[PDB]
């Protein structure tokens, strides 16, 4: 009687199953399906993360059931119908039905599926999905992967005056990206695990969400994202203290490079080919007239590219110092930064061969990157 039955647009179900799949990364994972009040609610969870998604469907009968996430994902992606019927048939299973094809998936008791934890938040605020995607995109790549340094295995989400900021570091580089809030929020500082950051970023970037807003609710132990009303993610937070990164930002520089971003990234990538693992270094030999990007690989060879001074936007190179500077970097850390912001030009602020480079993008005043050099 109270068995779930609904008709759903296949493309929409496929999108939801994609998000439900990636958060529990598989054969043991179950997805809860709940048809109520004109919508289907799809829930996925593990020890760290809980995702609830609601999509509009034609609810023929209200009810709930749970099935294998992977099997449901694999099946729906291969049905050709533009709409599917989902019907809980009891001992027969959950029936997924198109025009000519029927799959029965065995169900597991809904009583075995946990409800989303309650949160009683200490801070609550809303920002655009465009702004939130920006700050995660600009910081997720420089998270520490060293699972021992647990306080660095995520992004540091914090308030500074009216700025909502994300910072990340792995010891070799620092990334900072922020957006101005209109409201006066209490100062907080929490560390969002890498996986949660990756998953929420894909959610806000979805075409249905990117032009809308995301509500953020948090306390010391958990954070809740409500993305465009119908998608809710609850994540644990890392118990740790993020370092005071403010002292890591260079306050002065003795030379400045302005260069076409894509030209610089492509040249670094080309020259880095010759290097060997654990010896990943490219040398930037900077002068007013030319930049030489070079590298060596033991028992492989060496490589050099020359970039000439140019005021043409597509090949732009300007280095306004009489002194030459030869400074080395891990090419991956430069490439990560150059890929993170879509900009014609990039600015690099230097001191000596041992001091970090400050990297900025001219039209992007709320993104800052610091990268340490290597000796070359």
């Amino acid at each position: 009687h109270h068995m779930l039955k609904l008709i759903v647009e296949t493309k929409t179900l496929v999108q939801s199953l994609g998000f439900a799949s990636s958060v529990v990364e598989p054969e043991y994972a179950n997805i809860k399906l709940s048809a109520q009040d004109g919508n289907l609610e799809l829930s996925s969870t593990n020890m760290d993360l809980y995702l609830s998604q609601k999509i509009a469907v034609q609810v023929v009968s209200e009810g709930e059931c749970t099935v294998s996430t992977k099997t449901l994902n694999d099946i729906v992606r291969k049905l050709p119908d533009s709409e599917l019927t989902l019907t809980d048939l009891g001992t027969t299973g959950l029936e997924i039905k198109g025009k000519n094809c029927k799959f029965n998936l065995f169900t597991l008791p809904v009583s075995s599926f946990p409800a989303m934890d309650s949160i009683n938040p200490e801070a609550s605020f809303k920002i655009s999905c465009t702004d939130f995607a920006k700050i995660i995109e600009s910081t997720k790549f420089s998270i520490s992967l060293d699972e021992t340094r647990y306080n660095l295995n995520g992004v540091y989400l914090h308030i500074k005056d009216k700025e909502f900021c994300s910072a990340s570091t792995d010891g070799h580089r620092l990334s900072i990206s922020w957006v101005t809030l209109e409201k006066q929020i209490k100062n907080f500082g929490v560390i969002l695990p890498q996986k949660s950051a990756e998953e929420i970023l894909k959610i806000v970037k979805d075409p249905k969400n990117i032009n809308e807003d995301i509500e953020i609710l948090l306390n010391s132990n958990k954070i809740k994202f409500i993305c465009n009303e119908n998608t809710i993610m609850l994540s644990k937070l890392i118990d740790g203290t993020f370092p005071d990164y403010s002292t890591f930002i260079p306050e002065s520089s003795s030379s400045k490079l302005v260069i076409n971003r894509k030209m610089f990234a492509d040249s670094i990538e080309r020259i880095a080919i010759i290097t060997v693992e654990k010896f990943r270094a490219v040398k930037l030999s900077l002068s007013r007239e030319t930049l030489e990007i070079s590298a060596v690989g033991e028992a492989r060879g060496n490589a050099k590219e020359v970039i000439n001074s140019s005021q043409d936007k597509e090949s732009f190179y300007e280095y306004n110092s009489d002194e030459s500077l030869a400074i080395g970097f891990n090419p991956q850390y430069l490439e990560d930064v150059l890929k993170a912001v879509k900009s014609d030009l990039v600015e690099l602020y230097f001191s000596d061969v041992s001091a970090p480079v400050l990297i900025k993008f001219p039209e992007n005043p709320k993104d800052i990157f610091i990268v340490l050099p290597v000796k070359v």
């Binding site: 010891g171 070799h172 620092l174 002292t247 890591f248 041992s354 610091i370 340490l372």
Partner: peptide
């Protein structure tokens, strides 16, 4: 290969 002044690790 110098690191930031993080004091566990550097």
């Amino acid at each position: 290969v110098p690191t930031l002044p993080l004091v566990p690790x550097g």
